[PDB]
Specification:
Length: 130
């Protein structure tokens, strides 16, 4: 449907906006880009599904998200990856975990306030019909 395509274009606009706001926050800089192999060669070993905000943007533009739920699974992934890979009591680990939780909480709070529930329901219904 043209009406369905207008729905998804609006979804993408919404997601790019939320993602930009996360990406510009200083606390979240470490999540803006993939991890550099040279600097962290064991990351790829421990972390089987790397995710970051740059990859999120690419996926939005490739039309990979048909719902906000699907987007939020990638945000959750950014966070869970960080908790898994940096699990120690050390302060560098604690800082990154704190920041990962803040990224997740912030994405959820923005969505809670700004996503129309009927809009999401529509996306989910279109997705479920394909
Ligand atoms: C995303 C992430 C980055 N980093 C560090 C390693 C890299 O050298 C740098 C940039 O990714 O930040 C971690 O230690 N753990 C992580 O989970």
């Amino acid at each position: 449907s043209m009406q369905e395509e207008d729905t998804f274009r609006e979804l993408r606009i919404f997601l790019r906006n939320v993602t930009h706001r996360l990406a510009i926050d200083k606390r979240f800089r470490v999540f803006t880009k993939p991890v550099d192999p040279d600097e962290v060669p064991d990351y790829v070993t421990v972390i089987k599904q790397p995710m970051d905000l740059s990859s999120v943007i690419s996926k939005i533009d490739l039309h990979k998200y048909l719902t906000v739920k699907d987007y939020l699974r990638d945000i959750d992934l950014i966070c869970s990856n960080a908790l898994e890979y940096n699990p120690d009591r050390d302060p560098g680990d604690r800082l990154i975990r704190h920041r990962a939780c803040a990224l997740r909480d912030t994405a959820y709070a923005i969505i809670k306030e700004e996503l129309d529930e009927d809009f999401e329901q529509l996306c989910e219904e279109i997705q479920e019909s394909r």
